[PDB]
């Protein structure tokens, strides 16, 4: 069609406009990537946003009369206009020449457009593995590892999150070369083995599309893409093409010593000690002895923090150095009563996990003291 036209309730257009337009803020690579593609056909309005690496498509049912067609319109401006109209407002949209008109009551907006024919599309592909899972399960998997992803590392593949399917479980892995996080959850379906790297921005969009409702999440994974469906929203992302580190070989092989303590008391002791640790290197010293942990921090001003805790420990005495932010990140992600630490020696990685559950594990490499 040449004369796209539709009328929809603001109520029905607002959450879809947010789902797709959310990450279309900032400087688009190309001017058209700042626009949303609008398509009207056979009772449906489609709204697409992209950045060339991923795309977000929302479908809105059209109950009132409409004329088919397509155009692109500035995403944020279109969203702000619809959000700014009063509750219960009816929004009438139509192309007029090269402009998109938005009307509601006596409010009239004329928006600039770019041709729908110029809107980029992701390359077609086929899913190799498909499954469903609750939104809460995806959120738990992502929250348990996301903080361990690398921050703009030269090793591009550490900047994303590994998603792995094995047996009845979905697993995430993130590491930045100093610390690693891994979490596995049961999804109730027998699945083939697949391992993919989802880019940083894709992980952010997968989290953003979880509304906390009862709508299930359907996932499809291909060779070079991942796709997630929730209600009438579809998120697609390209995959990072690289070889991710293997977590099974990174987990300490034979931890000699086992320490157990209350998660919160250990977190509050590390948090207080962190105040007087070096602002750049963040080094703290752990001294483990019989049922006792001593945490010490010092900084260039020669200020010192010292925390003594009662813990459960019966191994040999040892001193080990850690970046206190890596330890606090683990303790903050373990939202549990008691935590277990598995040590070997002062120059080897430590494994940290909930003392009750093995669904998540964390590995932190020490620092020289």
């Amino acid at each position: 069609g040449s004369h796209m036209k539709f009328t929809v309730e603001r109520e029905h257009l607002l959450k879809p406009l947010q789902q797709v337009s959310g990450p279309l803020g900032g400087r688009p690579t190309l001017p058209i990537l700042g626009n949303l593609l609008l398509q009207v056909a056979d009772g449906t309005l489609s709204l697409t946003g992209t950045d060339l690496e991923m795309e977000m498509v929302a479908r809105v049912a059209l109950v009132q009369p409409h004329e088919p067609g397509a155009t692109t319109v500035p995403a944020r401006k279109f969203f702000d206009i619809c959000r700014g109209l009063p509750e219960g407002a009816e929004i009438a949209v139509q192309l007029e020449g090269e402009r998109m008109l938005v009307r509601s009551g006596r409010s009239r907006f004329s928006l600039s457009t770019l041709p729908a024919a110029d809107f980029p599309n992701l390359d077609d592909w086929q899913s190799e593995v498909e499954f469903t899972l609750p939104q809460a399960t995806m959120k738990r998997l992502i929250e348990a590892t996301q903080f361990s992803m690398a921050h703009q590392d030269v090793r591009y593949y550490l900047n994303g999150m590994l998603f792995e399917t094995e047996g009845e479980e979905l697993r995430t892995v993130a590491t930045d070369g100093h610390r690693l996080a891994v979490c596995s959850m049961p999804i109730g379906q027998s699945l083939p083995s697949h391992s993919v790297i989802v880019p940083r921005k894709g992980v952010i969009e997968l989290m953003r599309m979880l509304d906390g409702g009862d709508n299930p999440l359907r996932v499809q994974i291909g060779s070079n893409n991942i796709r997630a469906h929730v209600g009438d929203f579809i998120f697609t992302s390209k995959l990072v093409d690289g070889r991710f580190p293997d977590y099974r070989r990174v987990l300490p092989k034979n931890p000699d010593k086992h320490l157990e303590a209350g998660c919160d008391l250990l977190k509050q002791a590390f948090a207080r000690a962190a105040i007087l640790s070096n602002e750049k290197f963040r080094g703290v010293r752990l001294y483990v002895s019989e049922n006792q942990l001593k945490i010490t921090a010092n900084n260039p001003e020669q200020e010192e923090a010292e925390e003594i805790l009662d813990v459960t420990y019966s191994g040999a005495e040892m001193e080990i150095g850690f970046n206190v932010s890596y330890v606090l990140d683990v303790l903050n992600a373990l939202k549990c009563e008691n935590v277990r630490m598995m040590l070997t020696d002062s120059v080897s990685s430590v494994q940290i996990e909930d003392a009750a559950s093995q669904s998540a594990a964390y590995v932190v490499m020490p620092m020289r003291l």
Partner: peptide, 5 residues
């Protein structure tokens, strides 16, 4: 800081 791998 030591490398984990």
């Amino acid at each position: 800081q030591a490398d984990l791998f």
